[PDB]
Amino acid sequence: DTRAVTAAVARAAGAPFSIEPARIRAPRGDEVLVRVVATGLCHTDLIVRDQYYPVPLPAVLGHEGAGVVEAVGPNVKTLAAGDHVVLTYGACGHCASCAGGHGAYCRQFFALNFGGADADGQTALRDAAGEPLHDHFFAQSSFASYALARENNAIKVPKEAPLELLGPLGCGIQTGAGAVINSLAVRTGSSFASFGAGAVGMSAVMAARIAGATTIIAVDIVPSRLALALELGATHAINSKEVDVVDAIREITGGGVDYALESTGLPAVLSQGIDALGSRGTMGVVGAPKLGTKAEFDVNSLLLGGHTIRGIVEGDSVPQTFIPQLVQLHLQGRFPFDRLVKFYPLEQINQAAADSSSGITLKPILRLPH
């Protein structure tokens, strides 16, 4: 019982996406088949398209999907046709990390999210000529009008929420907001600095406001992002080309910030931000540089300051509870991540990729045809 889809396909390293007819098989096991309404586009999709992470091509990418369950496998227990879902990253659900509530550190994370196929090497998508299309990208491959996900990464959300907006809660927004709320455990009355005011950093700024922080510092080089950060809840905005960011943060906070989040991936920014921590302060790291990149820290500064540096994957959340919390906060007017979004038709995916790379659009969302 296969069915026709329209998909954006990456066929060559660094080449534009092609919009193509394809076919997807029926769900098996505890998979759900999702009619995809809209999917966020991320720099991470483009990094895979460029083969810096060489997921085998031709491939259907996309890892910020939102849609409606159309069919369920025989093992699905908790989703039903008609449910609205946000598609998040894959996890195995049975390893020690998954079992402890930390699926972000699943032993099988890279196989399930970057493998290009299921554990048997099979794909669920075929192209117009019947050839396999590498898929299972973040256990969803949601750059297509239909997607398969496992029940545990298809997150039910209230039907009254505006579904086409919600796909980026499956990755980038959960990463920034979860880094603040869960990993760093930012709380009432603390100071927080976001190094980077892209979609992840803005999500962190907004999350720190929700969590009760009284000083919320956005650091970037783009004046319009700094202006937007102030509108989204930051108390201070620092242009790092114009001041010494370490000295500036020390002035604002009286000696250094309680919590910081590095989302640029630039090791010089990371090394500098660690110096901006205050007594017992904690830097969380979510931006990834090229493999092999090192950062340095001053040992005595870390020691005498009681400083912490912590790596964070995907916001280290429990998505099935955390994504609906973010939806509710948004519905309450407390989490305006719609301000990060521009919508595009799937057909315009290459323009959205360009706008993502140029920074003109913090979070493109592609609307799928049906």
The phi and psi torsions of 239 (rounded to 5 degrees) equal -90, 110
Q: How far apart are CA 34 and CA 26, in angstroms?
A: 10
Alpha helices by DSSP H, 131-244:
172-178, 199-211, 223-231
Minimum separation from the CB atom of position 267 to its own copies (A): 6
106 binds Zn ion (CB under 5 A): yes
Cβ distance 347 to 208 under 8 Å? Answer: no
Structure tokens of 226?
A: 């700094």
Judged by CB under 8 A, the number of residues near its own copies is: 71
- Per CB under 8 A, contacts with its own copies among 258-317 are 265, 267, 270, 279-280, 285-286, 288-289, 291-313, 316
Residue 95 DSSP symbol: S
**Would the annotation count 171 as a binding residue?**
no
Nearer of residues 246 and 318 to its own copies, judged by Cβ: 318
The phi and psi torsions of 125 (rounded to 5 degrees) equal -110, 140
Minimum separation from the CB atom of position 223 to its own copies (A): 24
112 binds Zn ion (CB under 5 A): no
104 binds its own copies (CB under 8 A): yes
Q: How far apart are CA 22 and CA 205, in angstroms?
A: 40
| 3-state SS track over 321-357 | HHHHHHHHHHHCCCCCHHHHEEEEEHHHHHHHHHHHH
Sign of CA dihedral 306, 287, 291, 92: positive
157 binds, among its own copies, Zn ion, none (CB under 5 to 8 A by kind): none
Q: How far apart are CA 176 and CA 273, in angstroms?
A: 17
Q: Which stretch binds its own copies (CB under 8 A): 63-71, 193-201, 319-327, 361-369?
A: 319-327
130 binds, among Zn ion, its own copies, none (CB under 5 to 8 A by kind): none
Q: Which stretch binds Zn ion (CB under 5 A): 85-93, 222-230, 265-273, 319-327?
A: 85-93
313 binds Zn ion (CB under 5 A): no
- Per CB under 8 A, contacts with its own copies among 34-93 are 75, 77-78, 92-93
Distance linking the first and last C-alpha atoms of the chain: 18
Please identify which residue in 98, 229, 261, 340 interacts with Zn ion, judged by CB under 5 A.
Answer: 98
Task: Spell out, one character per residue from 141 to 180, where the chain touches its own copies: x when CB under 8 A holds, - when not.
Answer: ----------xx----------------------------
358 binds its own copies (CB under 8 A): no
What burial class does residue 304 get, using C-beta atoms within 10 Å of its C-beta: 0-12 exposed, 13-18 middle, 19+ buried? Answer: exposed
Paired residues of 144 in beta bridges: 7
Please identify which residue in 71, 95, 288, 329 interacts with Zn ion, judged by CB under 5 A.
Answer: 95
122 binds its own copies (CB under 8 A): no
Nearer of residues 220 and 316 to its own copies, judged by Cβ: 316
**Would the annotation count 106 as a binding residue?**
yes
Known binding positions for Zn(2+): 92, 95, 98, 106
Residues near Zn ion (CB under 5 A) are: 91-92, 95, 98, 106
